[PDB]
Symmetry: C2
Subunit: 250 residues, 2 copies
């Protein structure tokens, strides 16, 4: 079931694996020219390879979203493929597993730098670009933890909470330039990253806290992002959109 | 009338003026020992002077909440007056007035640093301290802009959004130590600063956006903080509490 998203380029920050990868492939298959951005070049390229192999169009750009210069570069790169109309700010990281009191300052600043500032840095030329060439859609990977909290993952939830405000505000200011901005809110998704660190017993626990009694799969998050990034979602801006098997309904 | 808040000390960061000042005096009058923290010594001291003069106990501490060392210092200071319960993290700042796109990197990092990180830095020894001496209550000055957005004040709303998550999460992990953590959400408050820097036509606009058809007064915010910081509010932790003349109900 394809999404309108054609004739456009899309930046998929942290697109080398998991959700970002799913998002990259899903957009790509619906005609989108995807710039797969990632810290790991080998991962970013493997995805581009998958896209191309399945008929699609795509280029890789390995770097650090924390560096504002990398944001303008991703824009100019994607923009070289086709007019930039989508941007999925997916790149995030878990911080130290500890209480607010015990939390290292480095870890806290780091998690915020990646999960929140990088988004902002990236969003800046994204917004100017889409505003120039007629409109578009920025999708920010928030989380369930943008509206609820989770013991020992302070920095994560704080940053994910901050996206919602950044999203809202960007949506207000660039609505009149027909640039939409939305925030997706996944629950716990089984990505190889989440699966690699976190036990069998641990994941069982988190499963039980979702109404569906399982974790989400990356494609399940990718569908909603693909939709929201498309012309099909042309009256949706500023809003936060859960995909959490009824995690927050409790 | 009075709030339970006696026997103990309270930190009121940014307590030299406006809301913080109102909060300082209100707690002080109900028996609380208040540590009035501010960037200005002359302002912080004027308040201490007012408290002492009206029968109360208070000490001043001028510094920068950005500096984590200043957080431990405020704790040990307040704690010298009386065991520490109550902490009102009020200190914040407005950033540059511009779009997300045009926003300077300095300004954005600054407002985040003050409006979000400083709170976190401060909260850390606040939490360990109250957790040691039996329990207490941290009140974080969020805003209406922690749940809605406001054109050109991107960084502000993003940071105010982040407090809600920081609040929620701290509340979860130190609930069992009987340390409550809540977030207050004022609407536009008529402080002497706000009146000077804002036009007749501008104020008309902001007033009209509140259901009560006026801006709040600092004491109106101070009442709810005083209450939440008291033993009277002993089943309130993790929650966000609006005082906005029905700004967000629209």
């Amino acid at each position: 079931a394809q999404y309108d998203v054609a004739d456009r380029s899309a930046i998929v920050t942290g697109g080398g694996s998991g959700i970002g990868r799913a998002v990259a492939l899903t957009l790509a298959a619906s005609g989108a020219a995807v710039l797969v951005t990632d810290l790991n070049e080998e991962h970013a390229q493997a995805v581009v390879a998958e896209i191309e192999a399945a008929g699609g169009k795509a280029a890789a750009l390995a770097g650090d979203v924390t560096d504002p210069a990398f944001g303008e570069a991703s824009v100019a790169g994607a923009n070289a493929l086709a007019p930039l109309k989508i941007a999925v700010n997916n790149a995030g990281i878990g911080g130290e597993a500890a209480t607010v009191g015990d939390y290292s300052l480095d870890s806290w600043r780091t998690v915020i730098e990646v999960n929140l500032n990088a988004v902002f840095y990236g969003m800046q030329p994204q917004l100017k670009a889409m505003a120039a060439n007629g409109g578009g859609a920025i999708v920010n990977m928030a989380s369930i933890l943008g509206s609820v909290g989770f013991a020992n993952s302070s920095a994560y939830v704080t940053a994910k909470h901050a996206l919602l405000g950044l999203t809202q505000n960007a949506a207000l200011e660039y609505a009149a330039d027909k640039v939409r901005v939305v925030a997706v809110g996944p629950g716990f998704i089984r990505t190889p990253l989440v699966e690699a660190n976190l036990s069998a017993d641990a994941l069982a626990f988190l499963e039980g806290k979702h109404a569906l009694g399982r974790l989400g799969e990356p494609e399940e998050v990718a569908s909603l992002v693909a939709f929201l990034a498309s012309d099909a979602a042309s009256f949706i801006t500023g809003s936060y959109h859960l995909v959490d098997g009824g995690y927050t309904a409790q």
